[PDB]
RNA sequence: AUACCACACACAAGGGAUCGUUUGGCUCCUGGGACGAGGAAGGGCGCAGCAGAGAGCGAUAUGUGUGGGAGCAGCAGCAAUGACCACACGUCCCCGAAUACAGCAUAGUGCUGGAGUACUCCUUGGAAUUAAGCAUAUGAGUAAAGGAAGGAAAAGAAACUAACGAGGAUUCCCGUAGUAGCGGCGAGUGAACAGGGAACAGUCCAACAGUGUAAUUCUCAAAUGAGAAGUUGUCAAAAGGAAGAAGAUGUGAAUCAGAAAGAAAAGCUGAACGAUACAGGGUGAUAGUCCCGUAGUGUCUUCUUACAUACGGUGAGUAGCUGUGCUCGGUAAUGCACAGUGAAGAGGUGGCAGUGUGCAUCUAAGACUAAAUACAACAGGAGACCGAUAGCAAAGAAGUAGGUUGACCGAAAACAGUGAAAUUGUGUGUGGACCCGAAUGGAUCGGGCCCGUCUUGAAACACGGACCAAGGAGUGCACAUACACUGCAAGUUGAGCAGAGGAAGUCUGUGAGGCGUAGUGAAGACGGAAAGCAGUGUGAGUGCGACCCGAUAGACUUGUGAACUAUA
RNA sequence: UAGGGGCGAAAGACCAAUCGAACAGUCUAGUUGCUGGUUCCCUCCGAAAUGUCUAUCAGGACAGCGCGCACGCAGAGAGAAG
């Protein structure tokens, strides 16, 4: 809309469109302001008063984190998804403490011991640059999803683990459906630690009980 | 609507609390009397020295001749007041006694 | 205009009208956070809040509940054997604009 | 006529080079420029914002401007010749 | 992972650094990795590579030469290698230039500051390494 | 149809679509908010060995000092006697507030002027538009024009609310509320206290200064003197500190080989190795170990901040009143002015005019004040954004080339990639405008008027359309609503805001308000049926540019014009 | 000597190819009951050009005639016989 535009008006033998004043240059007469012109303005232009984010109930996001957690440990559900599981022994897994590592050297021998070898694998394998323009803004490379770990107690094992490729991790307390159920699909495979997994009573509860920890809630 | 249900009988009941009383004040030390003198005083020698305004003479006329309900219009309307006319007539007349 | 509806009244004919947004939100809490823990340090054992009196709420409505207030009244912090200044050095709000009209709200600030 | 034949006679000229301005708008009848007001001591109005950011702070050189910035970057130091008097001041 | 908030991982602004770079940050770009041997008759692992320097070309279609650096371009950042060439129509003969990565040290040229420029890092070295 | 016209296919022309790519744009967030008489901002002119534009710099037109260290892009010459870069300093032509000047203060030195103005404060003040016409009203105290200041600005410690069992400076957020009301009672307009939070801080002058001596400020001298201001009244006390924050910069792990094939391996195949580092960028195809970094760790430099005296209850052309004009939701006056008139020392207020009288709450006509709040230029970081007819007008010497008498107006052009259609030549085939149905070795047979659009009615002697590519029109927000889907249910809810957390996501508290749990009346007053709340979306109404394009007109400027033409 | 203003031996003539109210720029994407245009396939259902009121007659609203979702269900655009 920067420039000064009129229409010519009829009797000119053209179309009543408005047009650039000018003189001297190939711009003088051409076609200015409208959607169907080269250089006009946009039909109803974006605007920042769009409405971005979304409510949900907070009852629904307490629920779905419920039976997200409880597809975890369902072994059709967990090979449905794509993770590969033929030569763990059982689901779930529970790490003990004492667990003293510090060093990745060591990290992995742990990994390699519960069965997770060809997960990691397939993981490693993946990494391709993405198709079309997504490549140009920042999101270059993309990579399977493989196991979360999930801790509750502070741990020289979280950094450890964390620079082999694929594998995540948060805490129990406030873990997110995004990583529960990636691209809205459930049943992520998971590591517990052994105190990780004993909080989950005082979280979600008993059945027909409420819950001390969220609080107005009940399975 | 939650609005106008009650009477206005049972709106004006009250709780009943224990009252504090007030701390009077009325004791007034040595040197604020002598204050307060002082400003008076000098009310007294600006008067002295210029005297009165024209509508504070029309006035004092008007009420040697009892003249007491035309006296009164008069000073409302200079001074727009009904309760400053009634006191400044209560001050000329005082001055005139 | 046509129908049934409840007649219109939506007051967007100004062309002189602000819009403001609120994608600053989570930036600031952040910010205000951060504010809280450096003034902490400057003054570490002593808390970041002082102490403030007990009140009972304006209306009808409302008498029924108990709320914070502004600052302790002189008669209030004298009747505890304190003096204005110690009281001031220790943490204790002052505000000399109350007053005081019942014996109940005097004994509980006390 | 008042097409072709009046364009003949079109051998005056009103305006010059201003002195302060550049812009070959000086009135030497009226002795006013049209672009910036000389002789008057502030500068004319322009008439809308698009026209008035052509002449703007930092369309040309800002020489003083970014020395400043500088020199107050640094702590302004001043010639290291003469640091007593700075210190003692 | 990064978790510096200051340094940046855009593509657009990683790749202007790199092209519109001047001065000691242009130099760093002319690296190239010593042989096993000079690695334990100095302490340093690289250096940037100089005329009169000897190299070992380890990629492309000049790989397994080697020979003395001539020249080295640093608007368009290529080395030129003595014997690593091409032949025009005319029989004329053009040196063809080596992006630096593809090199590897054999022998250094010792003339002028190159003494001092080695002595000065591997001091930075222990500085830090002794503490 | 020998050669014309049309169509199909192959080759050569002609043009620049499509696909692949991007040292640019845009949006949000965080920091910053740094000019001038010591001559600014903006304009002109000069300076290179070969030098037009642009960049850089001033007759010192690549000088000095510090920290580094290898070349200067072409040709000729230079360079460890320092190429080139980074930090500071020195030098800095003419015009321009442009000043050998104007106004003004002090014992004296001096200060102001111009630039910028997104955001803040003070004045002045429209019309288009809506009311389906229009004059009050609306748009709107908005646009435009003037004055002024800072990194914020303004405001600010009650001549304040309220009628409770009361609270207690200012500013900001959630809310009362599209309510009480204002209104050709039409269209439309429209606040306050509460209740829940962020951040918190209070003080000065006058009234009112030692009289057994102006004890006070300044100048010159001197080691104790002279003089200026002032009795129309001067003079009312502390050093001091470690913390906190932002930058700059050093260091920083671990790989070799091969068949086939390619211009080139980093791919593929086998064997290894690092990880508190698998963020991202560069290398002749897709790299943890080839190069620059990153996680982790060192140093250094700046900036911010902190103890003393004496006091109260009368601040005047003011508050108020009468008339008048503007203004506000303020209604028998909410605020502001002008003219007449004009107080008391005791006065002001308690959303409806007056008079009286108790009661409650405050103290005007002098001043200062942090934090929590707003937003350009310039710098840094991000993105379900755009990808060269797009995105800023501008991805190159873009406010440029170029243009107006003037105010002012204003383009195109990416890769030495790929290489579509319109259109042209040559060769080979098939037809005489072409489509649909059905066939021959071969003459052809039957059916069909030119599309889009308003219209009772178009093949029309109704209008638009020469041809091809690319662009090109029901969208976003607010408020009620009916339907479909989901959780809980006499209840329901992501208000704001706090606590946790390598974090614009997620989890947990505290805790208002709103609507519902039953209605009737203008109201006093009375009381007796019917599942709701919050979301995710779809159809539809109203207001904003509102599906896209289009008037003749109206207003406003401290903007321009008598080079053509009129008259002195 | 400059725009609701100038200048005119008067024609509403002339004031930069513009004058029964100049040019530049902004408010402004002024308004439009009027003209033009409005971009993929198949399946199923299917109108109206009438009445009342309107500064109403090239426009609206309310009702009548379509479609979608449908709680439910003895009815019918035809005859007899009084
Ligand atoms: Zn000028």
């Not at chain 4, 550049?22 to 502030?42: D, I, L, N, R, T």
């Not at chain 5, 770009?29 to 250096?47: C, H, T, V």
């Amino acid at each position: 809309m920067r420039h000064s535009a009129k229409s010519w008006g009829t009797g000119r033998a053209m179309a009543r469109v408005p047009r650039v004043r000018a003189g001297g240059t190939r711009r003088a007469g051409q076609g200015a302001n409208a959607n169907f012109c080269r250089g006009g303005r946009m039909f109803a232009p974006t605007n920042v008063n769009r409405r971005w984010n979304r409510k949900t109930l907070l009852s629904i996001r307490r629920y779905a984190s419920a039976m997200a957690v409880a597809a975890t440990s369902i072994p059709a559900y967990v090979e449905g998804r794509g993770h590969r599981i033929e030569q763990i022994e059982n689901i779930p897994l529970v790490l003990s403490n004492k667990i003293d590592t510090e060093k990745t050297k060591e990290g992995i021998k742990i990994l390699y011991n519960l069965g997770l070898k060809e997960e990691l694998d397939k993981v490693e394998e993946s990494k391709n640059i993405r198709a079309g323009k997504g490549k140009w803004r920042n999101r270059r490379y993309v990579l399977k999803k493989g196991p979360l770990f999930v801790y509750t107690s502070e741990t020289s094992f979280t950094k450890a683990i964390r620079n082999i490729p694929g594998v995540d991790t948060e805490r129990v307390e406030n873990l997110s459906i995004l990583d529960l159920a990636p691209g809205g699909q459930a049943g992520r495979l998971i590591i517990w630690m052994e105190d990780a997994f004993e909080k989950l009573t005082e979280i979600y509860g008993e059945m027909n009980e409420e819950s001390k920890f969220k609080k107005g809630y009940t399975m | 609507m939650k609005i106008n249900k009650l009477n206005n009988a049972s709106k004006a009941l009250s709780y009943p609390v224990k009252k504090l009383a007030k701390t009077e004040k009325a004791p007034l030390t040595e040197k604020q009397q002598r204050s307060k003198e002082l400003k008076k005083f000098a009310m007294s020698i600006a008067r002295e020295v210029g005297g009165l305004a024209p509508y504070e003479l029309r006035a004092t006329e008007l009420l040697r001749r009892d003249e007491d309900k035309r006296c009164k219009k008069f000073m409302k309307k200079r001074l727009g007041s009904l309760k400053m006319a009634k006191k400044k007539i209560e001050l000329l007349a005082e001055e005139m006694r | 205009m046509r129908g049934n509806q409840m007649l219109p009244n939506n007051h967007f004919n100004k062309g002189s009208m602000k819009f403001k947004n609120w994608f600053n939100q989570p930036m600031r809490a952040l910010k205000r956070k951060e504010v809280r823990e450096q003034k902490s340090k400057i003054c570490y054992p002593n808390p970041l809040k002082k102490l403030r009196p007990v009140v009972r709420c304006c209306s009808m409505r409302y008498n029924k509940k108990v709320r914070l207030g502004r600052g302790f009244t002189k008669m209030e912090i004298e009747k505890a054997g304190m003096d204005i200044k110690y009281a001031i050095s220790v943490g204790i709000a002052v505000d000399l604009r109350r007053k005081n009209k019942n014996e109940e709200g005097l004994e509980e600030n006390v | 006529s008042k097409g072709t034949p009046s364009n003949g006679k079109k051998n005056k000229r009103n305006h010059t080079t201003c002195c302060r301005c550049g812009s070959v708008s000086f009135h030497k009848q009226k002795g006013k420029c049209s672009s910036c007001a000389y002789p008057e001591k502030k500068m004319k109005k322009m008439q809308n914002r698009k026209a008035m950011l052509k002449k703007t702070t930092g369309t040309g050189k800002m020489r003083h401007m970014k020395k400043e910035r500088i020199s107050r970057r640094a702590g302004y130091p001043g010639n290291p010749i003469l640091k007593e008097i700075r210190n003692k001041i | 992972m990064k978790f510096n908030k200051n340094v940046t991982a855009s593509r657009r602004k990683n790749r202007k650094a790199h092209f519109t770079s001047i001065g000691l940050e242009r130099t760093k770009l002319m690296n190239a990795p010593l042989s096993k041997d000079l690695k334990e008759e100095y302490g340093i692992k690289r250096i940037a590579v100089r005329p009169g320097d000897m190299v070992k070309v380890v990629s492309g279609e000049f790989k397994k030469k080697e020979g003395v650096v001539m020249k080295v371009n640093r608007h368009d950042i290529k080395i030129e290698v003595e014997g690593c060439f091409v032949q025009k129509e005319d029989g004329k003969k053009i040196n063809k230039g080596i992006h630096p990565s593809n090199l590897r040290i054999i022998k250094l040229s010792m003339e002028k500051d190159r003494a001092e420029i080695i002595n000065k890092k591997v001091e930075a070295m222990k500085s830090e390494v002794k503490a």
